[PDB]
Ligand binder design. Sequence first.
Ligand SMILES: NC(=[NH2+])NCCCO
Ligand SMILES: [Ca+2]
Length: 223
Amino acid sequence: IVGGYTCAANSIPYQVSLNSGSHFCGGSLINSQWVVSAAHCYKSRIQVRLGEHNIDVLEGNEQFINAAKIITHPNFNGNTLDNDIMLIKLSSPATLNSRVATVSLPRSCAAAGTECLISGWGNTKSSGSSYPSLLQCLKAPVLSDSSCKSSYPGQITGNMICVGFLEGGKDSCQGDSGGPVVCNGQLQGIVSWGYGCAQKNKPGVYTKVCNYVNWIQQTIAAN
Ligand SMILES: NC(=[NH2+])NCCCO
Ligand SMILES: [Ca+2]
């Protein structure tokens, strides 16, 4: 997260870290047994780390649970990034408490201008690299579906939204991938793609979660 602030510890209780020797992507806990993330985050072996704030120190609220199943969207396209969504089944249920909690899926799509919270352990520098120990947070609005489409001509499908700031300096980045965009208590976005990060007129593009609730529920019920 570039241009963000350090979240209060455990204040984003649905945020997970996907780990494969180190942190590599975010995700969101949506059921005691299921995390949703981005298909471009796929790895065949993943440990889900719940209840984190400092990913470099055991602080006592962590639950480390291996992925039992990893299911990418059958229509994920690695070129266009359409359908950039993935589900991970935990090998045991997360134990839900104040620090490890589910986030609601969308009841509807979010209006343009809706304020959202984007979070993750991704790069924090707009130039160079600094990867944080502590979870970072960013408040950002859903952008006009036009301001999104003008930024990336011909590249925004109906399964993508832009959330962010056209002036730059405030965006998700590498390592935030797969993490949450939560607006009015609902998971509306998954960190997906962009052109670098925090550049002027290149806002973050996010998988539009309100199109996937049936896919999510059907996959959960079948697996
Ligand atoms: N604005 C961004 N490039 N964010 C997405 C990072 C790549 O998943
Ligand atoms: Ca920790």
